[PDB]
Every structure is written in C-alpha cells, then in structure tokens.
Amino acid sequence: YLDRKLLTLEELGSTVKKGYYQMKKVVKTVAVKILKNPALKDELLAEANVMQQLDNPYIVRMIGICEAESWMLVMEMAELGPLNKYLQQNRHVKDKNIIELVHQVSMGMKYLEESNFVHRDLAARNVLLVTQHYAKISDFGLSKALRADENYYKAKWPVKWYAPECINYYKFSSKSDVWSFGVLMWEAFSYGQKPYRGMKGSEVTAMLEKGERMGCPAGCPREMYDLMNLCWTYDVENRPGFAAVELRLRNYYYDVVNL
Numbered sequence: 001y002l003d004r005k006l007l008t009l010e011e012l013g014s015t016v017k018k019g020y021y022q023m024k025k026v027v028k029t030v031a032v033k034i035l036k037n038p039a040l041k042d043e044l045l046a047e048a049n050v051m052q053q054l055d056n057p058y059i060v061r062m063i064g065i066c067e068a069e070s071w072m073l074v075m076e077m078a079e080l081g082p083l084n085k086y087l088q089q090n091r092h093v094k095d096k097n098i099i100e101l102v103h104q105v106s107m108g109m110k111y112l113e114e115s116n117f118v119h120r121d122l123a124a125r126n127v128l129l130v131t132q133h134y135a136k137i138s139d140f141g142l143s144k145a146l147r148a149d150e151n152y153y154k155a156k157w158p159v160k161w162y163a164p165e166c167i168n169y170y171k172f173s174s175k176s177d178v179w180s181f182g183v184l185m186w187e188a189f190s191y192g193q194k195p196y197r198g199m200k201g202s203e204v205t206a207m208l209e210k211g212e213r214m215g216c217p218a219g220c221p222r223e224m225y226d227l228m229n230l231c232w233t234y235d236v237e238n239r240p241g242f243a244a245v246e247l248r249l250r251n252y253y254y255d256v257v258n259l
Contacts, residue, residue: 002064002074007032021063021074030063033073041071043141048073050140054115058108060128060138078128078136084192086129091191095221097132098188099253102181104135106246109181112137113174113242116146118153120172122180123161124187144172152176159201160194165236167205175239182231189220208234223252 002021009019009032019032035044051062051073063074080086083101087093105127112119120142128138144153152173157166163179165171183195195214196204213232216225227248233239240248 002066004066004068007066007068007072007074018077019074028063029077029079031075031077032066033075035071035073044071044073047141047143050117050143050145051075053145054112054117054140056108056111058104058111058136060136075138078130078138080129080131082125083127083129083135084124084187086192087124087188088192090132093132093191095189095219095224096256099221099224099249099256100133101127101129101135102185102188103246103249103253105137105184106181106242106249108137109174109177110242110246113177116148118144118146118172118174119177119180120144120153121158121161122177122184123158124184124192127184146173157201160196160199160204163236163239164205164208164234171236173236174241175236178231178239178242178245181242181245182228185224185228185231186214186217189217189224193217208232221252227252 006022007019010017012018012031015034015036017032017034019030020027021030033044035041048062048065051060055061060078061076063076066072066074109119109122119137119140121139122137126137126139128136130136146153152171155170155172159167161180161183163176166176186195187193196207199207211234213229216222227245230240231245
C-alpha cells in the first residue's frame with residue numbers, strides 16, 4: 001500500500017500515466033494504471049493480487065497499490081513499449097534479436113507455468129521492452145491462479161490468440177498460453193503484423209479446424225517456424241509446455257550466438 005504523497009504523476013494507453021515513486025533515496029520511474037469509477041474495482045484488485053505473487057525478471061513488477069483520488073496500480077516502467085509497435089517501427093532488428101526477445105518471453109512463461117498461473121492474454125501487444133534486448137510480460141487482468149488440484153481454469157476475447165479448447169470448451173491452461181505464445185512468435189517474426197489479417201474469429205476457428213495455420217514469416221528461421229507450428233498443436237495433450245518451448249528456444253538461440 002503506497003503513499004500517495006511519495007508519488008508524482010505526469011497519458012500513454014487508455015488512465016495510464018508515467019510517474020515517479022520516491023524510494024528510500026532514489027526516485028523510480030513508474031507506469032500507473034489509474035482506474036476511473038461499478039465492480040471494476042475488484043478487477044484491478046484481482047490483477048494486483050496476481051502481480052503481487054509474481055517475481056521474475058521477464059515479468060513486469062508491481063510496485064504497489066495506491067488508494068487516493070483514484071485507485072491506482074503502480075508498476076515498473078518499460079520505456080520502449082509494446083513489442084509489436086517497436087518492431088513495426090524497427091525493421092532493422094535482426095532475427096537473432098527477435099529470437100533473444102521471444103526466448104525471454106518463454107522464460108517468463110516457464111516461470112508462470114511453474115507458479116501455476118494462466119495469463120490468458122499472451123500477445124505481442126502485451127510484451128513490453130525495457131531495452132531492445134530485454135522484454136517483460138505485462139497485462140495480467142485476465143490472469144488466473146490455478147487451484148492446487150486442477151491444471152485448467154474454466155470460464156471480450158482475443159480469439160486469434162486462443163487455442164481450440166478455449167473456444168470449444170472454455171478451458172484455459174498453460175498449454176493454452178503455449179498456443180498464444182505461438183501466435184506471439186509469428187507476430188514478432190512478422191515485425192508486429194496482425195495475425196489472421198482481415199478474418200473474423202469464427203473464420204479463424206474454421207481455418208484452424210481444417211488444420212490450416214499461418215505461413216512462415218519472411219526471413220523467419222525455419223526452426224522457429226517449426227516451433228510455432230508445434231505451439232499450434234490442436235490436441236492439448238500433445239501440445240508442448242513452456243519447459244519444452246523454452247528449452248528448444250534456448251538451445252537454438254545459443255546455436256545462433258555461438259556461430
């Protein structure tokens with residue numbers, strides 16, 4: 001519970017403002033999600049409740065909650081902003097760099113999977129860059145802590161990022177997040193292009209059910225595209241977990257640096 005007088009506010013995305021929170025001696029730049037007036041309070045608090053439990057270098061950190069002229073969720077600042085926007089405007093970025101960033105996302109998700117949390121909104125728009133070589137996962141407003149005895153959560157949806165079982169059965173798991181990571185990787189290697197351009201969710205469902213998948217982005221290393229298709233395994237049971245996705249990305253990436 002943060003002290004309102006130790007917070008100095010400057011909009012970014014609308015309600016989100018850059019600010020500064022005085023720590024013991026140094027000021028920390030922060031991104032403040034400011035909430036404006038029914039039960040949307042419970043939602044922000046649920047999001048804060050989730051973020052409070054998480055501690056990983058590849059996940060945005062929550063500084064705290066500030067109750068004041070508005071409810072505010074105070075988080076660390078990722079200055080370079082969303083992964084898709086950054087790539088849309090930085091086409092010189094090397095596939096080596098993209099591999100690096102998506103690997104970082106896979107480590108954060110590996111941790112989230114260990115923590116038994118489902119993100120449920122994993123997309124390139126929700127990966128924030130600290131630097132060109134440092135990505136963090138953000139936006140936990142749809143996230144769920146799984147019960148100790150279950151491996152899925154049963155429920156507007158970003159259908160283009162959703163696995164078949166989410167659509168068909170409303171079942172969200174870490175494997176469902178793996179499907180979304182697949183779409184995220186396609187986004188990254190398409191330098192922030194939107195997936196399934198021009199299609200309605202229902203048409204996307206129809207495409208995937210015919211077994212069709214988005215093609216290999218221009219200049220995307222073949223082994224990366226194969227990873228995407230593995231993320232897009234229809235059957236949840238046969239789809240890999242983030243342990244296996246992260247492991248494959250790590251291996252490949254250091255066969256890249258090493259060379």
